[PDB]
Amino acid sequence: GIEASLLTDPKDVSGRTVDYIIAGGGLTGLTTAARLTENPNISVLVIESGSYESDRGPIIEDLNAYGDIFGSSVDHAYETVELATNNQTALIRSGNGLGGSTLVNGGTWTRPHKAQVDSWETVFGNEGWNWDNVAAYSLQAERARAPNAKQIAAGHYFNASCHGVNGTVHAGPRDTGDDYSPIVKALMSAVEDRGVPTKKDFGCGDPHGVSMFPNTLHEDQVRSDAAREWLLPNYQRPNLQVLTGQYVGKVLLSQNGTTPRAVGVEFGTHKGNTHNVYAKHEVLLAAGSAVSPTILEYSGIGMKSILEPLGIDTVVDLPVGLNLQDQTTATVRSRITSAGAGQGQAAWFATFNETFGDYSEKAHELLNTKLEQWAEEAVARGGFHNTTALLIQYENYRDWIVNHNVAYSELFLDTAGVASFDVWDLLPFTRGYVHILDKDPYLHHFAYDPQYFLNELDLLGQAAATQLARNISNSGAMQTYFAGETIPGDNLAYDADLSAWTEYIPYHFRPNYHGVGTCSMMPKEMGGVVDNAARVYGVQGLRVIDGSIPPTQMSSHVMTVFYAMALKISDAILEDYASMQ
Numbered sequence: 001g002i003e004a005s006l007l008t009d010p011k012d013v014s015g016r017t018v019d020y021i022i023a024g025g026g027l028t029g030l031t032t033a034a035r036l037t038e039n040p041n042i043s044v045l046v047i048e049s050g051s052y053e054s055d056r057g058p059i060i061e062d063l064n065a066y067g068d069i070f071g072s073s074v075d076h077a078y079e080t081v082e083l084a085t086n087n088q089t090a091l092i093r094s095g096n097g098l099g100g101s102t103l104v105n106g107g108t109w110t111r112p113h114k115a116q117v118d119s120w121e122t123v124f125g126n127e128g129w130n131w132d133n134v135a136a137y138s139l140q141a142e143r144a145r146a147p148n149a150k151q152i153a154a155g156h157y158f159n160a161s162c163h164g165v166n167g168t169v170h171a172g173p174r175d176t177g178d179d180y181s182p183i184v185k186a187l188m189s190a191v192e193d194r195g196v197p198t199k200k201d202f203g204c205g206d207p208h209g210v211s212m213f214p215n216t217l218h219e220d221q222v223r224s225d226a227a228r229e230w231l232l233p234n235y236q237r238p239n240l241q242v243l244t245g246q247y248v249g250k251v252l253l254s255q256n257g258t259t260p261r262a263v264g265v266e267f268g269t270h271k272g273n274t275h276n277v278y279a280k281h282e283v284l285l286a287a288g289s290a291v292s293p294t295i296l297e298y299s300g301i302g303m304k305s306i307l308e309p310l311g312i313d314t315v316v317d318l319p320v321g322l323n324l325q326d327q328t329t330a331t332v333r334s335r336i337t338s339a340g341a342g343q344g345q346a347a348w349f350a351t352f353n354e355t356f357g358d359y360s361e362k363a364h365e366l367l368n369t370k371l372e373q374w375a376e377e378a379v380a381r382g383g384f385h386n387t388t389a390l391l392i393q394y395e396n397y398r399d400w401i402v403n404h405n406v407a408y409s410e411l412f413l414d415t416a417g418v419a420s421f422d423v424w425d426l427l428p429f430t431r432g433y434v435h436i437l438d439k440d441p442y443l444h445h446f447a448y449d450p451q452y453f454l455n456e457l458d459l460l461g462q463a464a465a466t467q468l469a470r471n472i473s474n475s476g477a478m479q480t481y482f483a484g485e486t487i488p489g490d491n492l493a494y495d496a497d498l499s500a501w502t503e504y505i506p507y508h509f510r511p512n513y514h515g516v517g518t519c520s521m522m523p524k525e526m527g528g529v530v531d532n533a534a535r536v537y538g539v540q541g542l543r544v545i546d547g548s549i550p551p552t553q554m555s556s557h558v559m560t561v562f563y564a565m566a567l568k569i570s571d572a573i574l575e576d577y578a579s580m581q
C-alpha cells in the first residue's frame with residue numbers, strides 16, 4: 001500500500017536529482033505534486049516533516065473529532081512571541097503530516113467575494129489572478145455532491161453552477177446520521193428579521209448572510225484531506241516520490257551570472273546531520289505560511305537587517321516574513337432546549353454595518369480618517385516596511401467595505417447539543433511578521449508575531465462581532481432554543497457594552513490559523529516577495545506556492561482558493577517546463 005511506497009531513510013534520496021523538489025507535503029504541495037506528475041516524464045520529490053496519517057482512525061477521519069488531534073505529533077503547535085495585547089504567547093495549530101493542515105482542519109468549504117479576488121489583479125498587479133480565472137481552477141479541483149432532501153430541509157442550498165462535480169477534492173454535506181438541529185434555520189430566521197440574506201451558496205462569489213455549506217469529506221463522511229485526495233490515488237506513479245519525517249532547512253543556491261539559481265535543498269532534523277537533494281528544474285516551497293518565509297531567510301533570501309546579525313549573508317534582499325495576516329477568534333456559547341437537539345453547522349458572513357450595528361457611524365469615521373496613521377504605526381512595529389505601500393492595502397480594504405459591502409466578520413455556528421459561535425473579524429488591518437532568530441534551521445527558533453489587536457479597528461471589530469453573536473443567540477427564533485449563556489457566562493456581564501467587550505477580548509481569543517502573506521504575491525515595489533507566477537524575485541527556479549503568498553485576507557475559508565492557487569501555479573510551472581526543452 002501507500003505506506004510501503006513512502007521513503008523514510010535520507011540515504012534513499014541524498015545526492016539524487018529530480019525535476020522538482022517540493023518542500024512541504026501539505027495542501028498546496030500535494031496538489032502540485034499530483035498535477036506535475038501527470039506527465040510521466042516529470043519527476044517530483046516531496047519532502048514532508050510529518051508522515052502518513054490519513055487512515056489512522058477517527059481522530060483524523062471524522063470531522064466531528066475536530067481538535068482532538070491538537071497537541072499531538074500531528075500538530076506543529078507553532079508558538080508565537082509573547083503578544084503585546086495580553087503578554088501571553090499563543091499556539092498556532094498547523095498540521096504536521098501528509099496533507100498538512102487539511103489533516104486537522106474544520107473541513108469548511110466556502111469561497112470569498114468576487115471583488116476580493118478581482119483586486120489581486122487590479123490592485124496587486126497579478127495579471128490573470130481574478131475571480132473568473134481563480135474560481136474556474138477552484139471548480140476544477142472540486143468534486144462536490146448536491147444535498148439530499150434531509151440536508152435541504154435542514155437549511156442547505158446548492159447551486160450546481162457554482163461547483164465542480166468531476167474534480168479531485170470530495171466535498172458534500174456533513175451528515176452524522178442524526179436529525180439536523182432546527183437551530184440552523186432559527187439563526188436564518190433571526191437574521192432575516194434584520195433584512196440579512198440567507199441560504200446564498202457561499203461557493204458562488206457573494207458570501208453574505210447565513211448559510212450552511214459543503215465540507216471536505218466523502219459521502220461516507222471520511223475526511224477529504226489533501227493526501228487522501230491527491231496522493232493516495234497516485235502514489236504508484238514511479239515519477240512521484242515522497243520523503244517523510246524530514247525538514248527542508250534551506251534552499252541551495254548557485255550563481256554564475258546576474259541572478260542566483262535554486263539547485264536543490266538541504267534537509268534533516270538536526271544540525272550536523274543533514275543531506276542534500278537536487279532539482280533539475282525548480283524548488284517549490286509549500287511548507288506553510290509560518291515556515292516557507294523562514295526557509296527563505298535560512299537560505300540568505302530576506303532582509304539584511306534580519307539576516308546579518310544572525311551571521312547569514314544576504315544573497316537576495318526581500319521583505320520576507322512581513323505582511324503576516326491572521327484573524328482573531330472568540331467564542332459565545334449557550335445551553336439549548338431539548339427541541340434544539342441535532343447536528344448542524346452554519347455561518348453568518350456579516351457585513352461591516354451588520355457587525356458594528358449602532359457603532360457603524362463611529363467605525364466608519366475611523367476607517368475614513370485613520371488609514372495613514374495606522375499604516376505608519378504598523379510599519380513602526382515591523383509588520384511591513386513601506387508605509388505608502390501598506391496604505392494601498394488599507395485603501396483596498398476600505399473600498400471592499402464601503403463600495404462592495406463585503407463580509408467583514410464571520411460568526412460560525414456549531415450545534416450538536418449547544419448553540420456555539422466561534423467568531424472572527426475577517427479583515428484585520430494589523431500586519432505582523434515572522435523572522436528566524438538563529439541561523440540553524442533545525443533549532444526552529446523563530447519569532448512569529450501576528451500582532452493581534454494592535455490595530456484599534458481590529459479590536460473594536462472583533463468585540464462588536466462577538467457581542468453580535470451573543471445578541472443573535474437570544475434574538476428572534478434563536479430565543480426559542482436559548483437556555484442560558486455558558487461562555488462568556490460568568491466571565492462577562494450579559495449586558496456588557498462594546499467597551500467592556502474590548503477589555504475582555506484580548507484575554508479570551510485564539511488565533512484563527514488562517515495566516516497569509518509572509519511571501520506576498522504582489523509587485524516588488526509594493527513590498528512583494530513573489531511575482532504572478534509565484535516566483536521569488538531575483539531568483540531562478542524558486543517559487544513559494546502556499547498560504548504565504550495571498551497578499552490579502554478573504555471573506556471565506558481558504559481551502560477552495562488554495563487548491564485553485566496550486567493548480568494555477570502548476571500550469572505556469574508546466575508552461576516553463578514546455579518552453580525550456
Ligand SMILES: *[C@@H]1O[C@H](CO)[C@@H](O[C@@H]2O[C@H](CO)[C@@H](O[C@@H]3O[C@H](CO)[C@@H](O)[C@H](O[C@H]4O[C@H](CO)[C@@H](O)[C@H](O)[C@@H]4O[C@H]4O[C@H](CO)[C@@H](O)[C@H](O)[C@@H]4O)[C@@H]3O)[C@H](O)[C@H]2NC(C)=O)[C@H](O)[C@H]1NC(C)=O
Nearest residue numbers: 082083084085086087088089452453454502503505506507
Ligand atoms: C505587559 O507587560 C509590560 C511589563 O513588562 C507592561 O508594561 C508596563 O506597564 C506598566 C503599567 O502596568 C508601566 O508601569 C507604570 O509606569 C508609569 C510611568 O511610566 C508609572 O506611573 C506607574 O507607577 C504607578 O503605578 C504603579 C502600579 O500601581 C505603582 O506601583 C507606582 O508607585 C505608581 O503609582 C504612583 O503614582 C504616583 C505618581 O503620580 C506616585 O506619586 C505614587 O507613588 C503612586 O502610587 C507604573 O510603574 C510600565 O512603564 C510598562 N513598561 C515596562 C517596561 O514595564 C504592559 O502594560 C503589559 N501589557 C499587558 C497587556 O498586560
Ligand SMILES: Cc1cc2nc3c(=O)[nH]c(=O)nc-3n(C[C@H](O)[C@H](O)[C@H](O)COP(=O)(O)OP(=O)(O)OC[C@H]3O[C@@H](n4cnc5c(N)ncnc54)[C@H](O)[C@@H]3O)c2cc1C
Nearest residue numbers: 024026027028100101105106107108248546547557558559
Ligand atoms: C485548526 C485549523 C482549522 C482550519 N479549518 C479550515 C476550514 O474549516 N476550512 C478551510 O478552508 N481551511 C481551514 N484551515 C486552513 C487550511 O487547512 C490551511 O490554510 C491550508 O491547509 C494551508 O495549505 P498550505 O499548503 O499553505 O500549508 P499546509 O497544508 O499547512 O502544509 C504545509 C506542510 O509543510 C510541512 N512542513 C512544515 N515545515 C516543513 C519543513 N521545513 N520541511 C518540510 N515540510 C515541512 C507541514 O508539516 C505540512 O504538511 C484550517 C487550518 C487550521 C490550522
Ligand SMILES: *[C@@H]1O[C@H](CO)[C@@H](O)[C@H](O)[C@H]1NC(C)=O
Nearest residue numbers: 159160161162199200201204
Ligand atoms: C444559480 O446559478 C445560475 C447560473 O449561473 C444563476 O442564474 C442563478 O442566479 C443562481 N442562483 C443562486 C440562488 O445562486
Ligand SMILES: *[C@@H]1O[C@H](CO)[C@@H](O)[C@H](O)[C@H]1NC(C)=O
Nearest residue numbers: 351352353360361364402405
Ligand atoms: C453603513 O452605515 C453608514 C453609517 O450610517 C451608512 O452611511 C452606510 O450607507 C451604511 N452602509 C450600508 C451598506 O448599509
Ligand SMILES: *[C@@H]1O[C@H](CO)[C@@H](O)[C@H](O)[C@H]1NC(C)=O
Nearest residue numbers: 386387388389392525526527
Ligand atoms: C514604497 O511603496 C510605494 C507604493 O507601492 C512605491 O511606489 C515606492 O517605490 C516604495 N519605496 C520603497 C523605498 O520601497
Ligand SMILES: [Cl-]
Nearest residue numbers: 170218219220
Ligand atoms: Cl464520495
